[PDB]
Amino acid sequence: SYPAIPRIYAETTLNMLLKRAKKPRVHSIDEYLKDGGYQALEKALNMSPEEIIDWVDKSTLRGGGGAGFPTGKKWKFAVQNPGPRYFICNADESEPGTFKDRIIIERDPHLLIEGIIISSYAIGANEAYIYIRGEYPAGYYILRDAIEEAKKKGFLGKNILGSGFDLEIYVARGAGAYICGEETALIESLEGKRGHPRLKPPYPVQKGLWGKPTVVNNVETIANVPFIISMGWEEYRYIGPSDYAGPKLFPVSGKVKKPGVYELPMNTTLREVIFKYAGGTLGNKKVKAVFSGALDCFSSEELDIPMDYSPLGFGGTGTVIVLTEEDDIVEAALKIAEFYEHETCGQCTPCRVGCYEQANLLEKIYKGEATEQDWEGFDFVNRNIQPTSICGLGAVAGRLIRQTLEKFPEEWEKYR
Amino acid sequence: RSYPAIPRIYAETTLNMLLKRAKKPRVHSIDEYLKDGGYQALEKALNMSPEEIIDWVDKSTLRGGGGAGFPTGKKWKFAVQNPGPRYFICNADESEPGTFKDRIIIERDPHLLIEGIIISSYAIGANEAYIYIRGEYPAGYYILRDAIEEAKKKGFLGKNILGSGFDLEIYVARGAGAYICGEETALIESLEGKRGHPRLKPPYPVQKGLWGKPTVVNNVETIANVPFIISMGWEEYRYIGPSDYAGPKLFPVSGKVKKPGVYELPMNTTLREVIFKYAGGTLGNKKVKAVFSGALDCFSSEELDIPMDYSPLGFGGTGTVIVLTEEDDIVEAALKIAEFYEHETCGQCTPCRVGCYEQANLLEKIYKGEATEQDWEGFDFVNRNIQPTSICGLGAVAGRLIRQTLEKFPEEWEKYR
Amino acid sequence: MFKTEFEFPEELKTKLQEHINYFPKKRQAILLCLHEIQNYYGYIPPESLKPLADMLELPLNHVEGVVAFYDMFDREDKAKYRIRVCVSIVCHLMGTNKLLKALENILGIKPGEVTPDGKFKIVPVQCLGACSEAPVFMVNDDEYKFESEVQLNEILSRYT
Amino acid sequence: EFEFPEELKTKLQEHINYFPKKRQAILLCLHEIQNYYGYIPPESLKPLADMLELPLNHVEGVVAFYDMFDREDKAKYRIRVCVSIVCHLMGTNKLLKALENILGIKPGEVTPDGKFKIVPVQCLGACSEAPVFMVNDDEYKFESEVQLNEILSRYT
Numbered sequence A: 001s002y003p004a005i006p007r008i009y010a011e012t013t014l015n016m017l018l019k020r021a022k023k024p025r026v027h028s029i030d031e032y033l034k035d036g037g038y039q040a041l042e043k044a045l046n047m048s049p050e051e052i053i054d055w056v057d058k059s060t061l062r063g064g065g066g067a068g069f070p071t072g073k074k075w076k077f078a079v080q081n082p083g084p085r086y087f088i089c090n091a092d093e094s095e096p097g098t099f100k101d102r103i104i105i106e107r108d109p110h111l112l113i114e115g116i117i118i119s120s121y122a123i124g125a126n127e128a129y130i131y132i133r134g135e136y137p138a139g140y141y142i143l144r145d146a147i148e149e150a151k152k153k154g155f156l157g158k159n160i161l162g163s164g165f166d167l168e169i170y171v172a173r174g175a176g177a178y179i180c181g182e183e184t185a186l187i188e189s190l191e192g193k194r195g196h197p198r199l200k201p202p203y204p205v206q207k208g209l210w211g212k213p214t215v216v217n218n219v220e221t222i223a224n225v226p227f228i229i230s231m232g233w234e235e236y237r238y239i240g241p242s243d244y245a246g247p248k249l250f251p252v253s254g255k256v257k258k259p260g261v262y263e264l265p266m267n268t269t270l271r272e273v274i275f276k277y278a279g280g281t282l283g284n285k286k287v288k289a290v291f292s293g294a295l296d297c298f299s300s301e302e303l304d305i306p307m308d309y310s311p312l313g314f315g316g317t318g319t320v321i322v323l324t325e326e327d328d329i330v331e332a333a334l335k336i337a338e339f340y341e342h343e344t345c346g347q348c349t350p351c352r353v354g355c356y357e358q359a360n361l362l363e364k365i366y367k368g369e370a371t372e373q374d375w376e377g378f379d380f381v382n383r384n385i386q387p388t389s390i391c392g393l394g395a396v397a398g399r400l401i402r403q404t405l406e407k408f409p410e411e412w413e414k415y416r
Numbered sequence B: 001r002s003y004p005a006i007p008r009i010y011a012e013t014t015l016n017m018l019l020k021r022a023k024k025p026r027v028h029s030i031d032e033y034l035k036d037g038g039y040q041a042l043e044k045a046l047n048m049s050p051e052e053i054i055d056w057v058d059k060s061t062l063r064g065g066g067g068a069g070f071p072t073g074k075k076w077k078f079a080v081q082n083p084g085p086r087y088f089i090c091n092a093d094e095s096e097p098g099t100f101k102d103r104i105i106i107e108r109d110p111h112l113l114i115e116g117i118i119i120s121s122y123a124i125g126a127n128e129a130y131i132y133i134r135g136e137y138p139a140g141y142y143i144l145r146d147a148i149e150e151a152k153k154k155g156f157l158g159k160n161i162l163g164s165g166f167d168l169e170i171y172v173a174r175g176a177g178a179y180i181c182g183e184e185t186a187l188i189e190s191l192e193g194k195r196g197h198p199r200l201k202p203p204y205p206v207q208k209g210l211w212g213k214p215t216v217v218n219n220v221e222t223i224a225n226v227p228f229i230i231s232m233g234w235e236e237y238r239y240i241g242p243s244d245y246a247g248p249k250l251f252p253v254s255g256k257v258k259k260p261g262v263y264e265l266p267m268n269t270t271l272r273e274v275i276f277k278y279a280g281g282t283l284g285n286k287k288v289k290a291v292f293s294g295a296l297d298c299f300s301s302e303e304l305d306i307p308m309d310y311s312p313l314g315f316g317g318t319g320t321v322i323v324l325t326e327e328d329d330i331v332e333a334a335l336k337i338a339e340f341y342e343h344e345t346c347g348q349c350t351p352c353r354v355g356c357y358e359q360a361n362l363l364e365k366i367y368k369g370e371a372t373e374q375d376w377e378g379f380d381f382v383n384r385n386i387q388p389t390s391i392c393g394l395g396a397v398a399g400r401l402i403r404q405t406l407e408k409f410p411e412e413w414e415k416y417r
Numbered sequence C: 001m002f003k004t005e006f007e008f009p010e011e012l013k014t015k016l017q018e019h020i021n022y023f024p025k026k027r028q029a030i031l032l033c034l035h036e037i038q039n040y041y042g043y044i045p046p047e048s049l050k051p052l053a054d055m056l057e058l059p060l061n062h063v064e065g066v067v068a069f070y071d072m073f074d075r076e077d078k079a080k081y082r083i084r085v086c087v088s089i090v091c092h093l094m095g096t097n098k099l100l101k102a103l104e105n106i107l108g109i110k111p112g113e114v115t116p117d118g119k120f121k122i123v124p125v126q127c128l129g130a131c132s133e134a135p136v137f138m139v140n141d142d143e144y145k146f147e148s149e150v151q152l153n154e155i156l157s158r159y160t
Numbered sequence D: 001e002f003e004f005p006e007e008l009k010t011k012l013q014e015h016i017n018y019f020p021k022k023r024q025a026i027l028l029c030l031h032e033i034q035n036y037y038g039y040i041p042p043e044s045l046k047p048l049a050d051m052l053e054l055p056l057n058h059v060e061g062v063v064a065f066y067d068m069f070d071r072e073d074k075a076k077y078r079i080r081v082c083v084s085i086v087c088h089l090m091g092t093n094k095l096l097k098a099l100e101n102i103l104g105i106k107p108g109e110v111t112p113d114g115k116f117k118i119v120p121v122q123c124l125g126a127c128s129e130a131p132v133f134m135v136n137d138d139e140y141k142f143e144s145e146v147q148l149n150e151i152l153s154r155y156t
């Protein structure tokens, strides 16, 4: 018995990451095994760690946590440093609009676990962590139970299946901070501290948890690893466009008919995501904007872009929030400002004061209480959150809002 | 080295003795065993007289885990009343349907077994011991061979063990497909390089066994208790569970339960508790229809409140628990039991030879709806007449479970007739 | 019954010791322990931090800073059930305000407030990662889509 | 006219020298022979008997008695499928159907290439993992056809 979870809709054209997670319930180990689960692990343990890294490299797999970094390359960087090494699954998923990772955790936990074990083996980590946000309590209990199932079947513990490879997976919980999804703040939190990002370099792959080489990978990234081993890198690379191969998860929300998570190839366009897969708009209203989580704002003229990590592609985590013609862009911008206000960790001065002032002033603008100086101040602060920032939050806290100023000037001018 | 693939049988303990290590599904090698205090019971034992060890094992209340529940100390006493040399045999033939308790000790905690064999051998003055392991446990065979080598290298086997003047070699023999080689006299015949044919008893092995010499045969589980008795002393051992049936017992539970596996539990546990408290209840929460005690007994759902002890009303046997639920056809299940005895009778005794064959032949006809009236009456007759003239327990019990199903589930059988 | 130094009840202390023993290093258990404390008391009692700090072998100041930093922990208001209401972009777009209205009609409280019986506190939170089912709320660990007042009233009736 | 190859004869000699008496090694020797040849060659028994210092008919009787030994059919891989009560209850028939789907053979049959033989056996002592099968020395729980197919693909 687990806490109540909303039954998020899920749909797949590839039947990989969502093969089981398309059904909104927990799939336990027996069901997983019936689908050939943990056979990829067995195959992996008969390969060298170096071979596994090579396969993940050649697969073209990129991270699903936002930065799209090539996964095999990340692993290679970690293993050029002396051990011991640590592997961390980032299940902090707290960006607005983003709910893709939870359906893997909650419905197909063994897919994630299998990926963690293979990945840990590849980089020589004997200790792995899952860091799951505090507001996913069901996911936490589900993972704890699934880990015990895996232990009972001999996929975790010492000398896994006679390989000589040892692994324990520890499940840690967050306690309400978006910043703890940033890989260095996550590590600080795992060490029992506040979630304060560290100056990089060094990067976690060189000096991470307890100062040792540490690989942090997103849930979605790790869930790909069993498929790469099972199919082989070549067959995997045949999925989707050859430069951005394999499945991607797209959490679609807002003013669409079928909000939910879609597993699709990355040559799918944004227009197709909304209209071909997510059923079009509520009431068949015109699309006004798409927010890529709290990162970017695409206009209705930008819907024909690929959902890949190319320069002109959608990128990010594939988070699609749809606003239609009657939605007030300034009201939406305020919500985005409020998010960054609430999540800056405050270490850097322009971020600390800028995230606060951006929201403070935008609220005045929205309520019709802004002076001329508040308007000018808002413009200034929005352009000046990033200076001296040591993590991505400060770098992007003004980005989406600036895009709305550029793409929807007529709505803003109404408020001025 | 690499061992053959083995399924990872679930194991759970409330006592943390026999399954302290074997609850984890992997080979525990000698260094890990030593870290847990292993082989210190051996050291203690070698500083005791054989007679005192026998006395502690007697006072412990330890009983055999191979099905008969015979008091172990009493067995050893019988053997040492006879002039040597003497032989010690570990019975790892485990081939009764439902029974998989012994393999997880062998495969996961072999040093527990080895330590118990060394102590037991010393107790009875045997300088030669054997493990007879069924042929269908190849992994356990290789694991034991390797563990014995580990024990030799650390000085726990060989000549003059730990300066005691006690010499011991343990030889590992393999079976080759016969359930009957679990019967202690057939086992000995097989060890002597012959077919597994039970001997007329008396004499019993403790008098005349391997090469005609006093021989103690004990089950894997029995032997695995011995290090605990020496380590804890008989008083603390006897404090485990009820004082008359003290100590850990292993319960292999299978069939229609949520958590099939081996359970280490005290013998005051009830059958109902085994199924519902420990093994997670039934698949689909369907009603229990019957429990088969391996291929020996059939308990109905009105008999779940019995203790898992060796009392007259207790479950007894090897603690083998196969659970059938309300949708399971009892006649189909009885046929599988009949087929087992058909395949395992050694054929020395006429009523057993012909009875085990006919019981299965006729029950198949009944099952398939092809039995004549004479086939029905013949089945009833044969089922009651396997035992006459039998010289081992197989002929004595080949009809027992099936007769119980006939008495306890008359309505289902009537449907077939 | 004069006051003496705060001590954890045995059943809570046991749970805390379990978390502390779970990770390789004791101090890694700090958030699990704080969750456990808040679960037990309905908030983080200030007096609980000193003995927790001793159990973690951490300075009190370290523990206090952690409690202050993480938004899920509440040192000020005891409540049996926390109703976490998402106030982020998607929920706002799809009807946070209707949920808050329905909550006020049923419970008589607004965000940040606790009912007079100590039973419910409304806690505004950032995106709960269930945006396709907007507007989302939680009641302790349980999470739901808000549909209507009649539906919300039925849901809340299960919490007593 | 039949003679064991030297490498096998060495191994038989090791078993024969292992126990205090030669004749105790009979079952280990027969296992070794079957492992080597994929079955027990009838012609192998005479020289075995000589090394054991046993009459031929003694050895013949032993081979006949013990069900693991096969004098009839050569096979590289024996798939031992449990047909006893617990496995039957929990899905022996599904395993057998999956085997027929994949390999095209039934119990007692050998594939034409001599690669696989399905051998029906009594309880394998892994009843909690029913339905159970072995491939030579390796033992597995059957979960599904997809799972079984991947397992069998490991034997070439």
Ligand SMILES: Cc1cc2nc3c(=O)[nH]c(=O)nc-3n(C[C@H](O)[C@H](O)[C@H](O)COP(=O)(O)O)c2cc1C
Pocket (backbone or CB within 6 Å): A062, A063, A064, A065, A066, A067, A068, A069, A090, A091, A092, A093, A094, A095, A178, A179, A180, A181, A182, A183, A184, A216, A217, A218, A219, A221, A222, A391, A392, A393
């Ligand atoms: C403010 C901030 C928050 C982040 N939140 C997450 C998150 O919730 N999940 C995640 O996996 N990565 C998150 N990231 C990205 C991680 O720092 C890191 O890039 C990622 O976990 C690496 O795994 P990947 O290569 O598999 O994507 C965040 C980054 C920043 C700057």
Ligand SMILES: Cc1cc2nc3c(=O)[nH]c(=O)nc-3n(C[C@H](O)[C@H](O)[C@H](O)COP(=O)(O)O)c2cc1C
Pocket (backbone or CB within 6 Å): B063, B064, B065, B066, B067, B068, B069, B070, B091, B092, B093, B094, B095, B096, B179, B180, B181, B182, B183, B184, B185, B217, B218, B219, B220, B222, B223, B392, B393, B394
């Ligand atoms: C047909 C038959 C099969 C047996 N199979 C086994 C077996 O596999 N393992 C076992 O230890 N005892 C088995 N026994 C019981 C043994 O003959 C003997 O009682 C036992 O090995 C003595 O050890 P214990 O007193 O420690 O139980 C079997 C008995 C019979 C009649």
Ligand code: SF4
Pocket (backbone or CB within 6 Å): A179, A196, A197, A343, A344, A345, A346, A347, A348, A349, A351, A352, A389, A390, A391, A392, A393, A394, A395
């Ligand atoms: S940029 Fe902002 S969130 Fe990142 S470390 Fe600096 S203050 Fe904290």
Ligand code: SF4
Pocket (backbone or CB within 6 Å): B180, B197, B198, B344, B345, B346, B347, B348, B349, B350, B352, B353, B390, B391, B392, B393, B394, B395, B396
């Ligand atoms: S009773 Fe049956 S198994 Fe036992 S010796 Fe006689 S024929 Fe053989």
Ligand code: FES
Pocket (backbone or CB within 6 Å): A096, A097, A098, C086, C087, C088, C089, C090, C091, C092, C126, C127, C128, C129, C130, C131, C134, C136
């Ligand atoms: S915006 Fe409310 S759950 Fe994401």
Ligand code: FES
Pocket (backbone or CB within 6 Å): B097, B098, B099, D082, D083, D084, D085, D086, D087, D088, D122, D123, D124, D125, D126, D127, D130, D132
């Ligand atoms: S009944 Fe098949 S392994 Fe026991």
Ligand SMILES: [Cl-]
Pocket (backbone or CB within 6 Å): B043, B044, B047
């Ligand atoms: Cl001593």
Ligand SMILES: [Cl-]
Pocket (backbone or CB within 6 Å): C058, C059, C060, C061
């Ligand atoms: Cl202090």
Ligand SMILES: [Cl-]
Pocket (backbone or CB within 6 Å): D054, D055, D056, D057
């Ligand atoms: Cl001859």
Ligand code: NA
Pocket (backbone or CB within 6 Å): A051
């Ligand atoms: Na390769």
Ligand code: NA
Pocket (backbone or CB within 6 Å): A051, A054, A055
């Ligand atoms: Na390669």
Ligand code: NA
Pocket (backbone or CB within 6 Å): A092, A094, A132, A133, A134, A174, A175, A176, A177, A178, A179, A180, A181
């Ligand atoms: Na968090």
Ligand code: NA
Pocket (backbone or CB within 6 Å): B047, B048, B049, B052
């Ligand atoms: Na003594």
Ligand code: NA
Pocket (backbone or CB within 6 Å): B127, B128, D020
């Ligand atoms: Na000898």
Ligand code: NA
Pocket (backbone or CB within 6 Å): B093, B095, B133, B134, B135, B175, B176, B177, B178, B179, B180, B181, B182
């Ligand atoms: Na045997």
Ligand code: NA
Pocket (backbone or CB within 6 Å): B233, B235
């Ligand atoms: Na004493």
